Amino acid sequence: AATGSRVTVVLGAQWGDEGKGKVVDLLATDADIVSRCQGGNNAGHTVVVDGKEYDFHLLPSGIINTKAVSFIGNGVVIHLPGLFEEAEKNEKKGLKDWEKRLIISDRAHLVFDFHQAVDGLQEVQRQAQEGKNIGTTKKGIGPTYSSKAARTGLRICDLLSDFDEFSARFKNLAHQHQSMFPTLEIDVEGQLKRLKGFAERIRPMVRDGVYFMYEALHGPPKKVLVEGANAALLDIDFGTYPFVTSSNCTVGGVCTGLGIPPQNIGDVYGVVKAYTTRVGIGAFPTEQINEIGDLLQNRGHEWGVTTGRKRRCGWLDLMILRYAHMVNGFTALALTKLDILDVLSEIKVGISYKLNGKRIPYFPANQEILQKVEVEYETLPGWKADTTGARKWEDLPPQAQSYVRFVENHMGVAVKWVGVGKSRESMIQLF
């Protein structure tokens, strides 16, 4: 009553695609506000309600709940074209009146077309310049955040004020990018013209984000849900740098992205996949490039929704999870895709790393080290049974319950949800 209402947070605990869209969708059913705080459409969150499947990127996953307000915080980077393309793609799937329940923070930054093109150029250069790049989503997230830090970028509020001033600063930002890559095209007037349209198409949804969240956390009690993007080990500060995204996907990102103090943050849920996946380049200790990897990849559908690029798969890894927790302080976990392991006789789990026959004392800041470590595994018996229909703790067979406990025990955090299917109702609440 003194500090106001506290928000619930959902964050990825590994390298992304843990099932944030799913957990958020489940928790948004009775939420008054659902929001994104960092990242851009580099994120891809799948939701399955009824027989309908959605894949949001910029839209909060709660856009589905017509009785709730979806909010895009100041920490997010918005690419207007992608935003609308996404919305329409979903409008055709039944999404209606979204614009009436979507609010955009006027302090959020703009991803411009050249930011996306430059993202691609930087990757091609890194590839032909040293044999390997980052494995970026090519959405210009990195370039946009780079402009944000430089204070050269433009924001939502800039786009809605004097368009002439916006146009001038835009042109400068554009030319500055052609200095980095003189072959970059950039149809200044074309883009500039399209942007003018987006300004008016987006004007009625924009608002002051700070005042909006403050009012909501200190006005009559409200249920505010924060949908994280990307994941812990992809964090610009704490991830396997430089093979990371360019924002803080960890808990701190909720504060800096929505302008809310730590006391207004409550439950922080860590979405943990029963096994590990990585989309781009970089160290992956428990990576399984083999029969096992193909099975996880296959039974798990580990590939990009559009591009269809398959994701690297590997055994569960506790080193990254324990590390993720040290930074995020999860209050509970959502262990997902347990059903994928239904067919295994034995499941291995990475518990620690050894470099020179010696167990590293902690997760390496230098990603290059991880490439050299040897995983120390623990083999666990499989429950070899179909759990896709499990709806209660007791429904799960012995070996499966054991697997859940294994995770809680070695992370020191309790599992509150167990996923056994992509649809909303395919979950089990432990408490």
Place this chain on the structure above:
Amino acid sequence: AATGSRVTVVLGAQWGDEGKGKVVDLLATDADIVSRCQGGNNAGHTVVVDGKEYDFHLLPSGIINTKAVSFIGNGVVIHLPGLFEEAEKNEKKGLKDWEKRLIISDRAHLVFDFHQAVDGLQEVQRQAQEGKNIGTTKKGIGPTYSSKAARTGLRICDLLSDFDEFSARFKNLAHQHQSMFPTLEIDVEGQLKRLKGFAERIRPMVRDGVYFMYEALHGPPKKVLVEGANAALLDIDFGTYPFVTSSNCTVGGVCTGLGIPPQNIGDVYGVVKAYTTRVGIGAFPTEQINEIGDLLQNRGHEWGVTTGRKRRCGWLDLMILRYAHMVNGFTALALTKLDILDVLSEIKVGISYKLNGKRIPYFPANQEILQKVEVEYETLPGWKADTTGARKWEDLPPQAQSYVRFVENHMGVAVKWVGVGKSRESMIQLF
């Protein structure tokens, strides 16, 4: 006992130079750990203990307490040369054995010489390109953070591993900068050579920051103090963008800068100056370019310690303070430099802003708007008496106590400390 010990935070509530060094120094007397989480030596924190005066920038202000450990978190950007220059400058003032009680996070980023040069180049360009720049400290903070977001920058851990790999990536980062400014010099081998020295000179102090803080917050109880840098309205997200510094000086920055969850954050103190100051370019609603401004400037010594560049001065402004609080959620305040107002018959205080004869509902995200607003002032009687020797609430005269209450009341936060002198003992604890 479940979440571990909580840290105490000290943040600036205006546009910097509120007296963080002073408040932190006072609170570090019984602290086990004192640390910086964001910023670089763009910060300047003055401390006065006994008859000795210090001005730290990269070193936490608690470096003075030989029985405490000073820690530089992952969110900070370190310029090795400046670090040592600073330390030596203080060694000559009695600072001894600092290196034995200073710990550096291996995930912190490096400010390279060319980052500083580029910072200057970007400012000269902005000046001769459009009549005005940012008023940067010219420490390359912006450029370094720009590289961090791009993932092209190098970190402490990179500098301590394979120097050949570091040298190669360094060269690339350097050339990338000459593409932005082809006239940039850059003595690749020279700097590269100096850096090799710093690596070994700094090796014994570096450690894994995440494990270091986690151990401290969950091991036996400890008193951890976090020294903020810059200030709320200078925040890259919530400040008067683009006339801001390039990191989150607000509360969220503690989490992203030290890798600690919100539940481990406790008391968050807002250092509030009795009047307002701004070092660089940008809107300043209550700015007083006159006799009053000169007096505040004069009695307050509002100028850079080295460069001697005077700071813009103005009346206290509640709009920015209330806004700062919405984002930081201060638990208490430290109202400083009250003694500067000792000689005024009446003191004005900005309470709200009017644009078209109408009171704005909230702090403008667009800094350009602020330039157009008209401040609505409230005049208060001065206590016209010397308070430099006040040590208790009762010591302060009627009008002065009233001024303190005015601040608490219009901010909804209580004042816990009142400053009446730059030295440590020149403070008054209200509770």
